[PDB]
Amino acid sequence: TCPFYKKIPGTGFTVDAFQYGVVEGCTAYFLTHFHSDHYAGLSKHFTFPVYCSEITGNLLKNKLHVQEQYIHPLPLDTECIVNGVKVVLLDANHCPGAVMILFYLPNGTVILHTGDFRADPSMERSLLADQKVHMLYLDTTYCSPEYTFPSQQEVIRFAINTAFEAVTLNPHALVVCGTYSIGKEKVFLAIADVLGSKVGMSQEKYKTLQCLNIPEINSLITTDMCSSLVHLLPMMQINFKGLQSHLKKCGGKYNQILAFRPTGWTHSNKFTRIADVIPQTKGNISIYGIPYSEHSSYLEMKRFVQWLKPQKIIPTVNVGTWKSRSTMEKYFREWKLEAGY
Numbered sequence: 001t002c003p004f005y006k007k008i009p010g011t012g013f014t015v016d017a018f019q020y021g022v023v024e025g026c027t028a029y030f031l032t033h034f035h036s037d038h039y040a041g042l043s044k045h046f047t048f049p050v051y052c053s054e055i056t057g058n059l060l061k062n063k064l065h066v067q068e069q070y071i072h073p074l075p076l077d078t079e080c081i082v083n084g085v086k087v088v089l090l091d092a093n094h095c096p097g098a099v100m101i102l103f104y105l106p107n108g109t110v111i112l113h114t115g116d117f118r119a120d121p122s123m124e125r126s127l128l129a130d131q132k133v134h135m136l137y138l139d140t141t142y143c144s145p146e147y148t149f150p151s152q153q154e155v156i157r158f159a160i161n162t163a164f165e166a167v168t169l170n171p172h173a174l175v176v177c178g179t180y181s182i183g184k185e186k187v188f189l190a191i192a193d194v195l196g197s198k199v200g201m202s203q204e205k206y207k208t209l210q211c212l213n214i215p216e217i218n219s220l221i222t223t224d225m226c227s228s229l230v231h232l233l234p235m236m237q238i239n240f241k242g243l244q245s246h247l248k249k250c251g252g253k254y255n256q257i258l259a260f261r262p263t264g265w266t267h268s269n270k271f272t273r274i275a276d277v278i279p280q281t282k283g284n285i286s287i288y289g290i291p292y293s294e295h296s297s298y299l300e301m302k303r304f305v306q307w308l309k310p311q312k313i314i315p316t317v318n319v320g321t322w323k324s325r326s327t328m329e330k331y332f333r334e335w336k337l338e339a340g341y
């Protein structure tokens with residue numbers, strides 16, 4: 001049974017709704033981004049129209065093997081008509097290819113679905129500036145004031161400086177970065193750039209990255225592990241056992257590992273500053289957890305919503321408990337009373 005918050009009223013449209021079989025009345029299925037909780041259910045046998053970004057379309061075709069005739073890519077920042085309804089895709093500042101969707105309903109209502117997003121003041125000068133939005137379907141992942149983290153720029157500065165220092169001190173150190181989905185590519189690309197290396201990875205991860213329209217990508221990544229001193233591994237292998245095992249396979253080329261686990265928020269944000277972050281260490285292996293978020297902080301979310309001034313908000317994350325739902329509704333009312341809308 002498809003839940004109400006994945007349906008767009010007054011249309012034949014759903015958003016991120018592929019795990020419910022054939023949804024009654026759905027003439028077009030929108031996909032905001034290529035993360036498994038959102039695409040769950042799509043495969044080579046899907047036979048309905050899918051609307052998405054070009055990058056998402058590349059991943060559907062090459063990784064899930066969806067047939068080309070059912071993939072409908074749309075350009076960003078461009079008014080398009082889909083099954084008689086005007087829509088616009090906007091950059092979500094999430095992972096590559098991720099979008100927000102603006103729907104202009106036949107009755108005059110305007111709906112924004114954020115998909116997953118990291119709110120930014122730059123969104124205040126998109127096509128959102130032009131008109132009123134009545135309903136907002138909101139990525140509420142971190143909708144509580146305890147959720148603080150630094151800018152992406154500050155986290156990358158920390159990672160670059162940390163990696164460059166370690167490898168300049170010991171030229172026989174290897175850098176490893178964890179991954180389990182698309183997103184957060186800047187972490188490993190920025191470290192490899194400062195070290196003058198390509199990023200080495202499996203054939204499967206190389207395939208994924210080749211779908212993302214990143215400029216000059218062939219100059220930045222490789223499947224030749226022996227040529228690279230920055231390696232990507234599955235996130236599950238970023239632990240002392242898994243890294244010890246990987247070091248053995250490198251044939252005495254290296255005598256130290258510096259590893260990075262880009263998490264979302266963790267409780268150590270409530271205590272510590274980014275500059276003060278320290279690794280976990282056992283012998284010649286050190287592991288850094290770095291708070292690189294592709295979701296809005298509480299303050300970023302609050303600013304976006306108080307700017308947009310929607311008439312109704314529908315959360316799309318943390319919807320499963322009465323405590324979470326009550327907490328979110330209390331913040332939405334606070335924000336409106338403070339701003340005066």
Ligand SMILES: CS(=O)(=O)N(CC(N)=O)C1CCCCC1
Nearest residue numbers: 310311312313314329332333336
């Ligand atoms: C826009 S708001 O004031 O924050 N809001 C809560 C919400 N979920 O939109 C409600 C206001 C009263 C009518 C239902 C909507």
Ligand code: NI
Nearest residue numbers: 033035094116
């Ligand atoms: Ni996501």
